[PDB]
Amino acid sequence: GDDRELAILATAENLLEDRPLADISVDDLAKGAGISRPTFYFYFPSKEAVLLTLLDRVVNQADMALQTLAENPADTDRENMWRTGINVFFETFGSHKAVTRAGQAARATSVEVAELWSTFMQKWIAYTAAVIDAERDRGAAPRTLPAHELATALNLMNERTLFASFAGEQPSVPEARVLDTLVHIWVTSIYGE
Amino acid sequence: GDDRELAILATAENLLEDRPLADISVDDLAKGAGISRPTFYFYFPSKEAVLLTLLDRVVNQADMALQTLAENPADTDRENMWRTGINVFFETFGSHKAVTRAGQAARATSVEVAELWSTFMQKWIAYTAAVIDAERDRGAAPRTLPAHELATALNLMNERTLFASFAGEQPSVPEARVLDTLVHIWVTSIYGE
Ligand SMILES: CC1CCN(C(=O)NCCCCc2ccccc2)CC1
Ligand SMILES: CC1CCN(C(=O)NCCCCc2ccccc2)CC1
Incomplete structure (x- = not known):
């Protein structure tokens, strides 16, 4: 059954x-x-419904891993906090490259697929912005851009950059360099004045 | 004719x-x-060939504007240099939103469209990396990430962020905030240690 x-x-x-x-x-x-x-x-x-279910499973797997991380802080520096977080997405999607690829393509043709991606991207942006806000409140991060707007761009960067790397698109960051590349841009943009 | x-x-x-x-x-x-x-x-x-030609025109319009900019330096700070450059893409694509939207969608179905985007993205990344390299050589930018890899991620960010803003996707950065958002992330990631 x-x-x-x-x-x-x-x-x-x-x-x-x-x-x-x-x-x-x-x-x-x-x-x-x-x-x-x-x-x-x-x-x-x-077959479209099958893909939808597979994507749903992968997006929830990522979400639940992020929830886990969010509940038990790793006792580490700020750079490492962001790295461990981005790594949830790198490893989760990177472990399901075919579903990621097909799911991205299906956004064009499927309102349900488009809405699933949108729903979870909104959640992940919100979480990102909350952590930036916390870093600012504690005095670690400067009050520069609107945190939600910065969060938005950084999440969209990760979406496009991770998926180009996974698909071996030209251009792309080599998969073995993509986590360091993203973490750099996140940490400098979040802590930089 | x-x-x-x-x-x-x-x-x-x-x-x-x-x-x-x-x-x-x-x-x-x-x-x-x-x-x-x-x-x-x-x-x-x-009709697919018509779109291809329209996209070709828009991508070359952007490219030729960037060439113009590259030949006559604006006498300005480093933040402004990057802003004026990103603005070429914001204004060019933003002036042809329907072609941008259709052209992005067609990448999925059209090898020629996929190759046109790829060709110009590679050129723009290369130019970006050359300017980063110049900033490092003059002592203005620190030698952090591989310049080509940093350039790659920042260009992919702009591609995904600009096009989400133009399409009014959820999530997106409001179009009236997207240039400041991108310029911040570029300048902090390029000059930040
Ligand atoms: C489909 C997309 C979704 C967006 N992607 C992605 O990497 N977002 C990363 C969010 C990291 C959130 C976080 C903040 C602070 C500590 C731990 C975690 C890329 C994949
Ligand atoms: C289809 C994509 C292509 C990539 N996009 C984009 O904004 N790239 C910006 C490249 C800026 C190059 C530059 C560097 C220094 C001084 C002036 C200029 C977004 C649109």
């Missing part, structure tokens, strides 16, 4: 490593999950 | 303000340009 659904999701994620969603059929998904095409349609209306 | 082509391009840019390329027909383009559908096909193979 859960098992056929889990199998469909696992098949989909595995096939997306090889080709885009356009080139994967419901027949491909059913076959891989060891069910028939009508049984597939019991669990999902479309 | 040039005139029918120019009319087709002008019609296309005007219709893209209203609806996406998917919802614009060759018949819509021909009618607007005051030609027949077969005469259209003399000038362009597809």
Whole structure:
């Protein structure tokens, strides 16, 4: 039950490593999950719905990891605090590159996918701005740009930079350099006057 | 001749303000340009080719403005140098929001569009890195990150941040705040230790 659904999701994620969603059929998904095409349609209306569920799982995985981090402070410097946080996104999305790639592409065609990304990006920006605000309140960070606006640009940078690196786009920061690159820009822009 | 082509391009840019390329027909383009559908096909193979040409024009307009700026230094501080430069992109793309929007979407489906963006992003990153390198050589900027890697992330930030602002995406930096936001992050990350 859960098992056929889990199998469909696992098949989909595995096939997306090889080709885009356009080139994967419901027949491909059913076959891989060891069910028939009508049984597939019991669990999902479309292959598009399968992607949506896979992206939902990855975005929530990231969110829950960030929640964990937020509850137990690492006893470290400010640079390290930001690094550990960005690293949640690097490792989570970077562990699901095919879903990340397909999910990004689907924003163009899917209002539900567009709204899922938007919802979580708004949450992550809000959290970012709250931490900047806390750093300012304690006297560690200068009161420069509106914290929410700075947070916004820095999160959008990470979105575009991480995903270019993962996809091997030209241009991109090599994946082995992308965490240091982002952390630098975050720390200098947050603490810099 | 040039005139029918120019009319087709002008019609296309005007219709893209209203609806996406998917919802614009060759018949819509021909009618607007005051030609027949077969005469259209003399000038362009597809509506997709029309977009490609419009994007080519906008990207070259930006590039040529940056070339102009690069030839005649403004007698100003370092913050202002970066601002005037970023402003070329803000004003150029911001003056062609419908083409920018459609052109960004077309990267997913069009190898030629993907390669055009890539070509010019590589040029602009290279120029950025050259200016950072010059600032370091003169002793104004510290030798922190690899200049090309820093340049890369900052250009990708601008791409994603400007285009979210222009499209009124949620989340986005308000368009009236986006230049100050980007300039802050550029100057702090380039000059910060
Ligand atoms: C789909 C996008 C979402 C945005 N991305 C991303 O890296 N955001 C990073 C947010 C870091 C939040 C944080 C602040 C302080 C301490 C710990 C954590 C990139 C991926
Ligand atoms: C499609 C993208 C391309 C990248 N974008 C963008 O703002 N790049 C800014 C490059 C600024 C180069 C410069 C350096 C120093 C002095 C003057 C100029 C955003 C739009």
